[PDB]
Structure 1
């Protein structure tokens, strides 16, 4: 499935993820597309800062929903 990450500038990127992907996977997949080291990657979904140890499903991240990225 695909999910969307919207950046602060507004440009919306598209990732292929699986629900078991951890948030780590997602940050790697984001730097692959846009080159931002995960160290500067803060992801927000539903008013919660997204934690490295958990998986997309842990947060009920469903197919074709949107994460927002904020840098450090």
Structure 2
């Protein structure tokens, strides 16, 4: 399924993922596309910070869901 990630600068990125994909895997996909190291990235969905040891399905993230990316 496709998901969207918005940046602090107003950019939107589209990613192809599976509900069984891990958050760490998602961060890795972002690194590949934007060059941002996973340790400097924070992912938020519906006001909650997503953990690297959990999956998309655990957060009930559905197709065309939009995640927010924060930089540290």
The DSSP-based 3-state class of the residue aligned with 1:32 is: helix
How far does residue 26 in structure 1 lie from its aligned partner after superposition? 0.4
The DSSP-based 3-state class of the residue aligned with 1:8 is: coil
The equivalent residue for 1:9 is 9
How far does residue 67 in structure 1 lie from its aligned partner after superposition? 0.4
How far does residue 64 in structure 1 lie from its aligned partner after superposition? 0.8
* RMSD (Å) for aligned C-alpha atoms: 0.6
Within 2, Cα distance between the matches of 1:4 and 1:61?
Answer: 11
How far does residue 2 in structure 1 lie from its aligned partner after superposition? 0.6
Which runs of 5 or more residues in structure 1 are unaligned?
Answer: none
Aligned length: 72
How far does residue 12 in structure 1 lie from its aligned partner after superposition? 0.1
Within 2, Cα distance between the matches of 1:13 and 1:71?
Answer: 15
Length-normalised TM-score, structure 2: 0.97
Deviation string 1:15-56 (CA, Å, 9 cap, x unpaired) is 000010000110001011111000001000011011111000
Within 1, Cα distance between the matches of 2:33 and 2:24?
Answer: 15
How far does residue 60 in structure 1 lie from its aligned partner after superposition? 0.5
